[PDB]
Amino acid sequence: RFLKVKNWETDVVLTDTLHLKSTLETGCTEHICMGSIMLPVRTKDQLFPLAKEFLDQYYSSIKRFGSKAHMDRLEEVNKEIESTSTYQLKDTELIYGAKHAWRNASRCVGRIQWSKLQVFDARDCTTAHGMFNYICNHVKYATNKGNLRSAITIFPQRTDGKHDFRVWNSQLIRYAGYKQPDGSTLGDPANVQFTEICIQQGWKAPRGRFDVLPLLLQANGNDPELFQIPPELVLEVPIRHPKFDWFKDLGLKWYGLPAVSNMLLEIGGLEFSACPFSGWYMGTEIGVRDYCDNSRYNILEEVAKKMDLDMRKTSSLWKDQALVEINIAVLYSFQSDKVTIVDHHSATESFIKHMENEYRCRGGCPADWVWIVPPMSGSITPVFHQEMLNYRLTPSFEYQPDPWNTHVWKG
Amino acid sequence: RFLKVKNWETDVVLTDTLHLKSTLETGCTEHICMGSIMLPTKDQLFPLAKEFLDQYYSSIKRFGSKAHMDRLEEVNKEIESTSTYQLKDTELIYGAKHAWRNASRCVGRIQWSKLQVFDARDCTTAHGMFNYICNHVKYATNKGNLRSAITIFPQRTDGKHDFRVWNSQLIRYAGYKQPDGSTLGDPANVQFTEICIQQGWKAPRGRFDVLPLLLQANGNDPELFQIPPELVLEVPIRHPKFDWFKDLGLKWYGLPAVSNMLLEIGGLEFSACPFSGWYMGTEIGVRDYCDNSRYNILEEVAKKMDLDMRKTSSLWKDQALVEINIAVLYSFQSDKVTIVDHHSATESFIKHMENEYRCRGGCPADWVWIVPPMSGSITPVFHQEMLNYRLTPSFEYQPDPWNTHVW
Numbered sequence: 033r034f035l036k037v038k039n040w041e042t043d044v045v046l047t048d049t050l051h052l053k054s055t056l057e058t059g060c061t062e063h064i065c066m067g068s069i070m071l072p073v074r075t076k077d078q079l080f081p082l083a084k085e086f087l088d089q090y091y092s093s094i095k096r097f098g099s100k101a102h103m104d105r106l107e108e109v110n111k112e113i114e115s116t117s118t119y120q121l122k123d124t125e126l127i128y129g130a131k132h133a134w135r136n137a138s139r140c141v142g143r144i145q146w147s148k149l150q151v152f153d154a155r156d157c158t159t160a161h162g163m164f165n166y167i168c169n170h171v172k173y174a175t176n177k178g179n180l181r182s183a184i185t186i187f188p189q190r191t192d193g194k195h196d197f198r199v200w201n202s203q204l205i206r207y208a209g210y211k212q213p214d215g216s217t218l219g220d221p222a223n224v225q226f227t228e229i230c231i232q233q234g235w236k237a238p239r240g241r242f243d244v245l246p247l248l249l250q251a252n253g254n255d256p257e258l259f260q261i262p263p264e265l266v267l268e269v270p271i272r273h274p275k276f277d278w279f280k281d282l283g284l285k286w287y288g289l290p291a292v293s294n295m296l297l298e299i300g301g302l303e304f305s306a307c308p309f310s311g312w313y314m315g316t317e318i319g320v321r322d323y324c325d326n327s328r329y330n331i332l333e334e335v336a337k338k339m340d341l342d343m344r345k346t347s348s349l350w351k352d353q354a355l356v357e358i359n360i361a362v363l364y365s366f367q368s369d370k371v372t373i374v375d376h377h378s379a380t381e382s383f384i385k386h387m388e389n390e391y392r393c394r395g396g397c398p399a400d401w402v403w404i405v406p407p408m409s410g411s412i413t414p415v416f417h418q419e420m421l422n423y424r425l426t427p428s429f430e431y432q433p434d435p436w437n438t439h440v441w442k443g
Numbered sequence: 444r445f446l447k448v449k450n451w452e453t454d455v456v457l458t459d460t461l462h463l464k465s466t467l468e469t470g471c472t473e474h475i476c477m478g479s480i481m482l483p484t485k486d487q488l489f490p491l492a493k494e495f496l497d498q499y500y501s502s503i504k505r506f507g508s509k510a511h512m513d514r515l516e517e518v519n520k521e522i523e524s525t526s527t528y529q530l531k532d533t534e535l536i537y538g539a540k541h542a543w544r545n546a547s548r549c550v551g552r553i554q555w556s557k558l559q560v561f562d563a564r565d566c567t568t569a570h571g572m573f574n575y576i577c578n579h580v581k582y583a584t585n586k587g588n589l590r591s592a593i594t595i596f597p598q599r600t601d602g603k604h605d606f607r608v609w610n611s612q613l614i615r616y617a618g619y620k621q622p623d624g625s626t627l628g629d630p631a632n633v634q635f636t637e638i639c640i641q642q643g644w645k646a647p648r649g650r651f652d653v654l655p656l657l658l659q660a661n662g663n664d665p666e667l668f669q670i671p672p673e674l675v676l677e678v679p680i681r682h683p684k685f686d687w688f689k690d691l692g693l694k695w696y697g698l699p700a701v702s703n704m705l706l707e708i709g710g711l712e713f714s715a716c717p718f719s720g721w722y723m724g725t726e727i728g729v730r731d732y733c734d735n736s737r738y739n740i741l742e743e744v745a746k747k748m749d750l751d752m753r754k755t756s757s758l759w760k761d762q763a764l765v766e767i768n769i770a771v772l773y774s775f776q777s778d779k780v781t782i783v784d785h786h787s788a789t790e791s792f793i794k795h796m797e798n799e800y801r802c803r804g805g806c807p808a809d810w811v812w813i814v815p816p817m818s819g820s821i822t823p824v825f826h827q828e829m830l831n832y833r834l835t836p837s838f839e840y841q842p843d844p845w846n847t848h849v850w
């Protein structure tokens with residue numbers, strides 16, 4: 033069956049057939065759409081079909097489907113599963129797997145870059161000190177003195193689910209938030225709980241507005257251990273505005289490297305519960321969300337005051353005005369310091385090109401519209417007007433519950 | 444089977460049960476989500492009739508009363524005999540209000556119960572349609588102080604005797620195919636503007652020409668009517684700070700009035716039910732003024748503000764978009780024509796969502812339409828999970844009449 037998507041700005045009509053390879057479920061039914069819901073141990077029995085599915089995909093892509101090497105590899109995996117109960121990915125399969133998880137990430141506007149992904153193989157890792165080193169190296173390689181390169185580091189897969197590798201941080205680099213006795217927060221409000229855990233675990237907190245949190249790392253199902261990224265490995269950008277000279281005295285800065293560490297990479301049935309990955313920012317992730325959610329730094333008031341906007345009625349659009357100025361300041365700063373960043377206009381445009389190309393070359397591109405359209409100026413970006421189809425392909429990145437909810441404490 | 448919705452800004456969790464009475468299909472499956480697609484006999488009539496009357500009598504606290512069973516019988520009898528039935532005034536008023544209450548794509552539903560309903564079921568001709576519509580326009584406009592209303596022409600019969608209002612809105616500007624190659628007026632309306640010309644309209648060929656109504660009665664060929672100019676309240680667009688804004692020659696109309704939808708109540712189909720409320724600012728300033736395929740004035744505005752249009756990263760589009768929208772609100776306010784801004788309106792839908800969760804057990808909402816087309820994440824609806832499902836009575840899209848009318 034063929035499914036058509038229309039762009040209402042251009043009238044371009046695309047045809048999806050790739051949704052026919054979709055496996056996992058969406059959360060939706062014929063009676064309810066759960067399209068705006070944020071969140072809508074594996075036996076031999078289920079594992080070989082998944083391995084087989086993945087390996088048929090790998091071997092088609094390299095143009096060897098049906099070859100001896102393909103059959104022999106099916107055979108080899110088959111055996112390994114029924115004798116040790118799991119199996120090991122080859123280097124080529126792991127690289128391919130991790131690229132495709134990104135390619136299949138329907139909530140990711142940056143996918144035009146999916147084939148340029150430096151894969152770091154950390155499957156020989158055994159301790160939390162080992163993980164630290166691996167993560168320091170990724171951070172240095174990815175940062176690259178401001179010329180950001182996309183990368184992922186992949187630690188040993190799940191075994192019995194009692195011996196998991198996890199990164200407890202939700203991003204490798206993030207600012208502490210501290211809830212004060214008066215009910216206010218210093219630093220990033222989103223990170224308060226993580227920051228209490230670290231403090232509990234022994235971290236001595238400076239207690240400023242921008243403290244880079246320590247990594248909290250779990251190897252082999254063991255209790256997590258604290259480590260401090262070397263500051264010289266943490267590129268930061270002070271934020272200033274091209275026209276407004278008072279902007280800088282707001283005291284704002286941000287880190288250059290966005291690096292998601294709390295997700296689970298599934299490849300061919302295997303579960304990599306520690307796979308920190310990193311790319312580069314779209315400006316609005318900082319200027320819209322990080323600075324301007326009420327539940328984050330919430331600097332909109334202070335910025336509108338200083339621009340002397342009429343603040344006594346929402347209808348002056350003072351919030352909208354302040355938000356655009358802040359975002360200007362974020363792109364200006366990153367650009368001035370030569371730290372890679374992309375604006376939301378250029379990023380949505382690249383995506384639509386990527387999306388069309390994926391339809392022509394792959395029969396589709398699963399895309400989640402709620403996530404792809406930027407969180408300011410939606411309708412003046414070309415994705416707003418693009419119909420999309422959302423579906424789940426493997427390999428894939430998945431959410432997992434935070435580890436402090438599920439960890440069996442040892443000693 | 445009971446479903447939770449979380450607000451990520453407040454942590455407020457609401458529990459939806461209303462979806463279990465969801466009747467129609469969404470377009471999604473367990474394999475594919477279609478959340479972002481624009482358009483995803485006697486034997487069926489009685490169930491539909493029954494389901495509706497059941498909710499009506501429940502609403503008036505008379506579920507399973509003599510009056511209730513008596514009516515179910517009376518309707519059951521009318522259908523068996525006539526193949527259709529007629530709604531009581533009270534049923535029709537309740538049905539229209541609930542079609543709006545159930546509009547998953549409408550941010551303005553806090554207002555659903557203040558809807559003045561005009562029963563035009565006795566209408567027989569286009570001239571009659573025209574009279575009813577002018578009365579609707581004048582009543583709803585109310586010299587700038589807008590009031591919600593719907594006018595309801597006679598229901599579908601054998602489907603070759605449909606009443607349709609061919610315009611997509613009661614009041615829209617003309618769009619013209621030009622020798623130049625570009626587009627004069629509103630490009631949304633080009634086709635329809637040509638159908639009017641082609642039935643005899645005398646286009647004045649300007650940027651802002653109020654289109655003539657094309658009305659169809661009892662499946663007849665449609666006719667033209669010029670809404671009296673003095674009933675069309677228009678607003679000149681100026682900026683509270685930029686003196687030059689005026690010189691762009693921008694105006695919009697005060698009355699948003701959708702006329703191309705099909706209202707379905709208890710299985711009955713009202714193919715002509717133009718309805719109107721009042722504008723959210725962004726509807727004119729973001730979409731009407733700034734869409735590529737619309738008036739598309741951002742470049743012209745950015746220029747007058749002397750912004751750096753060399754690179755997209757100066758955010759020149761975004762800056763101009765805010766100002767264009769500031770001017771829309773300011774103008775409507777200055778001329779005292781009701782408008783709501785997107786902050787105020789989404790904050791209202793949130794309180795209305797809460798009320799519906801506690802009073803009705805839920806609220807179908809299409810997040811993709813609810814979240815404004817500018818500044819999404821700074822409005823509270825950005826962070827609010829929503830469930831989308833189809834309840835009846837409802838408004839539905841229908842084929843544009845010309846594609847269908849046997850001429």
Ligand code: HEM
Nearest residue numbers: 134137139140141142145182183309310311312313314429
């Ligand atoms: C090249 C630079 C990249 C850019 C500009 C980019 C852009 C984005 C943005 C703006 C989001 C949504 C964040 C939000 O608004 O909450 C996102 C989500 C995501 N991206 Fe990327 N991305 C990039 C690289 C990558 C990489 C390297 C990966 C992993 C290989 C990745 C995988 C994902 C995933 C899994 C999500 C969903 C996150 C979640 O569900 O919490 N992206 N992308």
Ligand code: HEM
Nearest residue numbers: 543546548549550551554591592718719720721722723838
């Ligand atoms: C009272 C002020 C009202 C406000 C502020 C309002 C707001 C809106 C907005 C902003 C949209 C999205 C429009 C778009 O972006 O295309 C919309 C859609 C809609 N509203 Fe309202 N509304 C109002 C009154 C009404 C009334 C009186 C009705 C019916 C009685 C109604 C029913 C609908 C329907 C069916 C849609 C979806 C139309 C479509 O799918 O194209 N609304 N509303």
Ligand SMILES: Cc1cc(N)nc(C[C@@H]2CNC[C@@H]2OCC/C=C/c2cccc(F)c2)c1
Nearest residue numbers: 070290291292309310311312313314317431
């Ligand atoms: C590699 C990468 C590049 C890039 N530009 N952006 C991303 C993803 C972004 C980066 N900053 C945070 C975001 O990750 C998701 C954060 C929130 C998501 C979330 C999802 C589910 C539940 C929840 F609580 C939160 C990743």
Ligand SMILES: Cc1cc(N)nc(C[C@@H]2CNC[C@@H]2OCC/C=C/c2cccc(F)c2)c1
Nearest residue numbers: 481699700701718719720721722723726840
């Ligand atoms: C009553 C009302 C008030 C209000 N503020 N807004 C609305 C709905 C708005 C009025 N202007 C645009 C929108 O009407 C329908 C928009 C287009 C929808 C559409 C649906 C299917 C196909 C298509 F081409 C277009 C209705």
Ligand SMILES: C[C@H](O)[C@H](O)[C@H]1CNc2nc(N)[nH]c(=O)c2N1
Nearest residue numbers: 416417418419479480481811812
């Ligand atoms: C493709 C997508 O479904 C389409 O562009 C939608 C997106 N959201 C919208 N939201 C509103 N309010 N109005 C619209 O016309 C649309 N168009």
Ligand SMILES: C[C@H](O)[C@H](O)[C@H]1CNc2nc(N)[nH]c(=O)c2N1
Nearest residue numbers: 068069070402403825826827828
């Ligand atoms: C409720 C809703 O699904 C949720 O708040 C989403 C909306 N869109 C988003 N879009 C992006 N890019 N990132 C997000 O975190 C969210 N949050």
Ligand SMILES: [Zn+2]
Nearest residue numbers: 060065471476
């Ligand atoms: Zn869906």
